[PDB]
């Protein structure tokens, strides 16, 4: 996994574009995502 | 001219309480940006 740089990525199943980065989210230990306005993901918990 | 005077800087001064103590003073220009932002927010909802 890389950060800080635009990545072609997929995480179960859920395909997208973007720079992922590290992030102070507090994700609770249930939530696997988290999502914009749009219905968009936004966050994610890595599953590895 | 010192009363003519003296009622211009009390009513000049009048208009920083009046706008102090009047948060819908500025509607006008708080509704054209609050219609702008209900639009954008309506537009991006719309993706979901």
Known sequence: L????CVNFNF???????????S????LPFQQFGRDIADTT??????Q | Q???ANQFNSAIGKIQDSLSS??????????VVNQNAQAL????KQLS
Request: net charge positive; glycine share 10%; hydrophobic share 35%.
């Open chain 1, 42 to 47: 936004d966050a994610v918990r890595d599953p």
């Open chain 1, 12 to 22: 179960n199943g859920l395909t997208g574009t973007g720079v992922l980065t590290e």
């Open chain 2, 22 to 31: 009047t948060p819908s003073a500025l509607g006008k220009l708080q509704d």
């Open chain 1, 24 to 27: 102070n989210k507090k994700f």
């Open chain 2, 41 to 44: 927010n309506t537009l991006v």
């Open chain 2, 2 to 4: 010192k009363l003519i």
């Open chain 1, 2 to 5: 890389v950060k800080n740089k």
